[PDB]
């Protein structure tokens, strides 16, 4: 599923990401845009054999189990396939754990490079939440 900008903003708000750990809603929408281009089915391989999954490109090295990343962890205690659903529940729940792991939203490299410090509110502007 390829979410629309406002469609995702509304869903993320309902899933409690607005101001989560001090990060306004726009940060999360912006992160999804540059990580997955709003595609819930996005999968991208990393050089270490791990893979990034879903709307927020959560990796199998530490967060989910995809059964093909030896010596990795599954801190979110979920199959990586759960992060590829049209329903963002699993991705949001895992993202909430990630953002509290010590580096805030810096865990998302695309957010760090394209969103951090910018007018992220523009990503939810004009949207019905």
């Amino acid at each position, epitope marked *: 599923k390829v979410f629309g900008r406002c469609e995702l903003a509304a869903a993320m708000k309902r899933h409690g990401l607005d101001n989560y750990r001090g990060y306004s809603l726009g940060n999360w929408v912006c992160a999804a845009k540059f*990580e997955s281009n709003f595609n819930t089915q996005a999968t*991208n*391989r*990393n050089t270490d054999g*791990s893979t*990034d999954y879903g709307i927020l490109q959560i990796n199998s090295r530490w967060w989910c189990n995809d059964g093909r990343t030896p010596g990795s962890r599954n801190l979110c205690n979920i199959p990586c396939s759960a992060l590829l659903s049209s329903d963002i529940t699993a991705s949001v729940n895992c993202a909430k754990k990630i953002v509290s792991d010590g580096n805030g939203m810096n865990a998302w490299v695309a957010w760090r*490079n394209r969103c951090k410090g910018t007018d992220v509110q523009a990503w939810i502007r004009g949207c019905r939440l």
Partner: nanobody
Amino acid sequence: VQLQASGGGSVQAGQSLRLSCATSATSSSNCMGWFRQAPGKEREGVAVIDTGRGNTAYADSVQGRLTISLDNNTLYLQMNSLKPEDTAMYYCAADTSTWYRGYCGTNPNYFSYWGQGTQVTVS
């Protein structure tokens, strides 16, 4: 001449091209790669390499045809069996070592550095 891409050209499908870029790579970056862009379109990740380990990753669209390598200080992109869909501007990119990265990915948004691009046209 830093991160300046070259090697592009206009060729028939099936032929090959070898893109290159100068670096200065294992000290200032964790990851280096190549991304491409068509007029009015978004950047598309093509290949990436871990500057320290040498491990690589590719986009599904170029898997088995393109090869990224680092001759620590030149970055190469061997393009074999070119397809019409490969037509676009190619750029070489790098990230910053000021941030830890235990692995690398092709997402263009994972790289804050890049230089001049080179055109690849395949008919």
